[PDB]
Write a protein that binds this ligand. Structure first.
Ligand SMILES: CCCCCCCC/C=C/CCCCCCCC(=O)O[C@H](COC(=O)CCCCCCCCCCCCCCC)COP(=O)([O-])O[C@@H]1[C@H](O)[C@H](O)[C@@H](O)[C@H](O)[C@H]1O
Ligand SMILES: CCCCCCCC/C=C/CCCCCCCC(=O)O[C@H](COC(=O)CCCCCCCCCCCCCCC)COP(=O)([O-])O[C@@H]1[C@H](O)[C@H](O)[C@@H](O)[C@H](O)[C@H]1O
Ligand SMILES: [Fe+3]
Ligand SMILES: [Fe+3]
Lengths: 309, 309
């Protein structure tokens, strides 16, 4: 079934995609296209991939893009996590150590969330009779424990049904999405609701492929973070919550040591009063340590197309 | 910049996509996914592809799918032609020789076109004052020249502006698309208009990438064919027209020896009368030779998602 060897493949790819060039070429795009096409052709030879199979793959990719699910698929196949594995190894080779660990962004960030100093309430109260109240708090410091005032703590997470605002058009705009600037003591406090883990859209393209792979499409409960500050490396991270069925079986492979938090229960009447609440709530501490930006440091910032509102 | 070797990549891909499987798996889909992901990860290592670059690639693929242009991109990068190169080599190894050569289908077939016996007029006459009339005719035979009656000759082509019906919603439904069944003499005749070659949509995703590659997105003038008959191998082919600027510079690499036709000019008053026309016209002969279906023969039919109306 081998109709072409790699030499013959490379010659064909060059004839079609390089020899045909006239005028200015983007050299990087040319390099990447030539490599990926040659690899695709060689996989077609090695696995004897039939035209009907190739068309099914392209039809799948078309459907995935129309469903806006390619970011989700990048998470599920483990490509998004792989990019973090690479970034961690690049940082190790730079001698950059310390700092809260990174993990995946996911595909559901939205720019433009309400900003406040030191404290934000993240939810609109529309689920107050059906989900636990959660307070999250932490201090943002450098690697030696010195507080950072004015650090930008961006948080987003799912509602009691595992759905995110903007994508779920039934929620109010920016529900469960906030930017909190750390106060004079380096502190942030978020008053919110307990996120639940969630699956992929069950009739969607990502779950369709996971089904063929015998795989589930679930993530454990988590809260996403961007943390940034002048003079420090930007951090993309999350915490997961101890106790979740899928904690160490995340379909997007994002859970890490250092990023698992325990939700404590507060039933004490005095403490409840102090928080201006009326019922028991859950409490999570999540401190963040940022690494100073050095001339030698690889960038920790990632350009990516992101929703805005 | 090499953070992982292929052994480490393969182990990671297995951990994420295979070890996580529970219950029935589609073994072929699993095999192909594992191979393509491992290859993608290795290309990322070898070329030190940055997260921002990966996200740009996925955003491009998303945009391409939303624009319904991935079939067009398959043609332009030469993947569609490569599939034919493979099919030709498989046929050679089977000892299948003879027959009109195959070439690419393109992405613009529509099922459901008007059917008639022996003769069809393909155009609605809406361009009669701005484009040349073309008569196409041919005989469909086996490899020894014996006529085949009742062969299904499916033809589609572009209008005077290089646009195809169904996709160009300004044209009448099925304009320049017909199915003609060969008559008792194995003959088909199509009365139509001269197609013009065309480019990719200039603001679309395919041309955007071709621009980065320094490449044009043009095809020479051509008419597409499916030819099928009981007992014979289905044929996907075209003819191109001698004289076209892009005849041997097709951005989708479809031109072949054996598939170039010369448009003859008919100015003779007697012949014009015979055809029931009033002006000179162009004439193309395109005969088709079909190969008998043998038990040993690979399939020449391709399952593919196709428009219908
Ligand atoms: C670049 C080009 C390379 C790829 C292109 C070339 C590679 C060729 C790939 C060949 C794959 C083998 C095909 C085997 C035959 C298919 C059988 C089948 O059951 O049909 C369908 C399966 O088709 C597939 O999903 C296979 C394609 C997956 C390839 C992409 C893997 C990406 C890997 C690496 C890239 C990095 C990944 C990047 C990270 C994002 C089942 O139907 P469906 O549930 O999948 O979808 C269903 C469905 O079909 C329903 O009918 C519909 O109603 C519903 O909505 C839909 O969900
Ligand atoms: C499976 C996953 C693998 C890939 C995923 C992983 C691989 C990662 C790929 C990395 C590529 C290198 C990126 C370099 C930096 C980009 C710079 C730039 O100028 O930005 C843009 C270029 O971005 C690209 O097109 C690069 C991605 C191409 C990769 C796909 C090749 C497929 C090969 C093989 C697969 C078989 C092919 C299959 C056959 C079909 C220029 O803008 P634009 O004109 O391209 O689009 C423009 C634009 O950006 C405008 O802003 C917009 O308005 C307009 O509409 C749009 O058209
Ligand atoms: Fe999330
Ligand atoms: Fe065409």
């Amino acid at each position: 079934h081998h109709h072409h060897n790699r030499q013959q493949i490379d010659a064909l790819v060059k004839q079609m995609n390089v020899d045909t060039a006239k005028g200015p070429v983007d050299e990087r795009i040319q390099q990447v296209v030539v490599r990926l096409l040659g690899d695709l052709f060689q996989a077609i030879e090695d696995l004897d991939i039939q035209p009907s199979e190739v068309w099914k793959g392209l039809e799948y990719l078309t459907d995935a893009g129309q469903a806006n699910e390619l970011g989700l698929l990048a998470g599920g196949l483990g490509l998004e996590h792989y990019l973090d594995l690479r970034a961690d190894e690049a940082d190790a080779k730079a001698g950059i150590t310390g700092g809260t660990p990174r993990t995946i962004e996911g595909p559901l960030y939205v720019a433009g969330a309400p900003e406040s100093v030191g404290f934000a309430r993240m939810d609109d109260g529309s689920e107050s009779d059906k989900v636990d109240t959660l307070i999250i708090e932490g201090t943002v410091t450098d690697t030696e424990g010195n507080i950072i005032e004015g650090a930008k703590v961006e948080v987003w997470h799912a509602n009691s049904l595992g759905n995110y605002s903007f994508f779920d058009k039934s929620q109010s705009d920016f529900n469960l999405r906030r930017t909190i600037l750390t106060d004079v003591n380096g502190k942030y406090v978020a008053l919110t609701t307990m996120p639940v883990g969630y699956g992929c859209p069950p009739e969607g393209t990502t779950q369709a492929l996971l089904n063929k792979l015998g795989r589930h499409g679930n993530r454990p409960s988590h809260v996403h973070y961007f943390v940034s500050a002048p003079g420090y490396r930007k951090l993309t991270t999350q915490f997961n919550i101890e106790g979740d069925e899928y904690l160490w079986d995340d379909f997007a492979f994002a859970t890490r040591d250092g990023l698992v938090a325990t939700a404590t229960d507060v039933t004490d009447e005095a403490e409840i009063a102090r928080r201006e609440l009326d019922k028991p709530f859950k409490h999570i501490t999540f401190n963040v340590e940022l690494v100073k930006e050095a001339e030698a440091a690889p960038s920790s910032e990632v350009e990516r197309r992101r929703a805005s509102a």
